[PDB]
C-alpha cells in the first residue's frame, strides 16, 4: 500500500486518468532520496513516453502515474520494492534505493 506515495505539486484536469493500453507522455526528473539527481527527460528537451500495461517501467511508475490526471505535476516517492529492489539499476542506482521522481503528465496517446 506504500510502494509509491504521490504528492501533488500542481493539479491536472481531475478527469483524464491513464488506462492500460494508453501511452503516457511525461517530463520527469529522478533523484535518490538524498536529493542527488540521476536523470531527467528535461535535460534532453524531449518528453518520455511509456505505455501502461506492458511492464515498460518500474512498478512505482506503473501505479504512481496512473493516479495522475492529464496536466498534473506530482512527486512520486517509490520504495525499492516498487523500483529496483536489491539489484539496483546497472551503474546508476544502488541496491535498496528509495527513489523520488518529479513527474508531469503532459498528454495521453
Ligand X SMILES: C=C1CCN2C(=O)COc3cccc(c3)[C@@H](CCc3ccc(OC)c(OC)c3)OC(=O)[C@@H]3CCCCN3C(=O)C(=O)C(C)(C)COC(=O)[C@H](C)NC(=O)[C@H]2C1
- Which parts of this chain interact with ligand X (CB under 6 A)? 28, 30, 38-39, 44, 48, 50, 55-58, 61, 84, 89, 92
Q: Which helix (H) or strand (E) holds 64?
A: helix 59-66
Q: Determine whether 82 is an active site residue.
A: no
Instruction: Name the residue with cell 506504500.
Output: 2
Q: Name the pairing type of β-strands 4-10 and 73-78.
A: antiparallel
Q: Report which DSSP code applies to 80.
A: G
For the question of residue 13 being annotated catalytic, the response is no
* Shortest Cβ 57–ligand X spacing (Å): 3
CA 91/CA 88 separation, integer angstroms: 8
Q: Which one from 48, 78, 93, 101 is the annotated catalytic residue?
A: 101
Q: Active-site residue among 48, 78, 82, 84?
A: 84
Q: Which of 17, 39, 50, 81 is catalytic?
A: 39
Look up 58 and say whether it is catalytic: yes
Q: Which residue(s) pair with 19 in the sheet?
A: none
CB of 107 to ligand X, least distance (A): 16
Mind telling me the catalytic residues?
28, 38-39, 58, 84, 101
Amino acid at each position: 500500500s506504500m510502494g509509491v506515495q504521490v504528492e501533488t505539486i500542481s493539479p491536472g484536469d481531475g478527469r483524464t486518468f491513464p488506462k492500460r493500453g494508453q501511452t503516457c507522455v511525461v517530463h520527469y526528473t529522478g533523484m535518490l532520496e538524498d536529493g542527488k539527481k540521476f536523470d531527467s527527460s528535461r535535460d534532453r528537451n524531449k518528453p518520455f513516453k511509456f505505455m501502461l500495461g506492458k511492464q515498460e517501467v518500474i512498478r512505482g511508475w506503473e501505479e504512481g502515474v496512473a493516479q495522475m490526471s492529464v496536466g498534473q505535476r506530482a512527486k512520486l516517492t517509490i520504495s525499492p520494492d516498487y523500483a529496483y529492489g536489491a539489484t539496483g539499476h546497472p551503474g546508476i542506482i544502488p541496491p535498496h534505493a528509495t527513489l523520488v521522481f518529479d513527474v508531469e503528465l503532459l498528454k495521453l496517446e
